[PDB]
Amino acid sequence: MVSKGEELFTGVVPILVELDGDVNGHKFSVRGEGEGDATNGKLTLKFICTTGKLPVPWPTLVTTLVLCFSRYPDHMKRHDFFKSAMPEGYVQERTISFKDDGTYKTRAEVKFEGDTLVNRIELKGIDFKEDGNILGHKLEYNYNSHNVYITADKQKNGIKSNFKIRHNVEDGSVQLADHYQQNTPIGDGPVLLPDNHYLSTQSKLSKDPNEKRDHMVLLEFVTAAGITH
């Protein structure tokens, strides 16, 4: 163990996710629950739209709706910023630019509340086309595997990332979502600033057959890679 934070992730940790959103003035909320295991990189979450019908496709929210559950190999433990900020946690901020469409701006706090790892998010969506892939619901209910490159941000005592998500469109086209991310500790205690590396992601989206509300079941694996030793 190379951070106090890392001790909080030796087993399965229950998770709560809460998101309050506004896309082109359409107000919606999501709550998710499940668990994460950073020892194997496995995350199991079920999300509900608490306000009724989700006004955007579920796949567009996957990245917004807990990289502290990434599996960092033993040789990479000193490059795990996300756990090092725990339990006080970190702020995760993004701009997500949907190519030829609107933008999500997100601010989340990821931190322990009691024994639960909580991801609490505000999302603002602007400049979406009513007949675009997003407000038009033209995106397939599926998800690609990605590499998410992590860099140190010495000045902010945190990390940055930029990456493109590819969303499959019902017409066989692809909707690009360009992510710009910043993470900063909530605490003023010491954190691990990493050497350059990447996270390998893979996401399976499914439905709960008993669930009549608008929802998404997520199975994710996230693994850190890219450090020689």
Swiss-Prot record:
Photocytes. Changing residue 66 to N: In R10-3; matures to the red-emitting state with excitation and emission maxima at 555 and 585 nm, respectively. Keywords: Chromophore, Luminescence, Photoprotein. Contains a chromophore consisting of modified amino acid residues. Maturation of the chromophore requires nothing other than molecular oxygen. Green fluorescent protein has been engineered to produce a vast number of variously colored mutants, fusion proteins, and biosensors. Further generation of mutants led to more stable proteins (at 37 degrees Celsius for example) with brighter fluorescence and longer fluorescence lifetimes. Changing residue 201 to I: Suppresses the 475 nm excitation peak, leaving only the shorter wavelength peak at 399 nm. In H9; increases fluorescence at 395 nm excitation. This is Green fluorescent protein. It comes from Aequorea victoria (Water jellyfish). The gene is GFP.
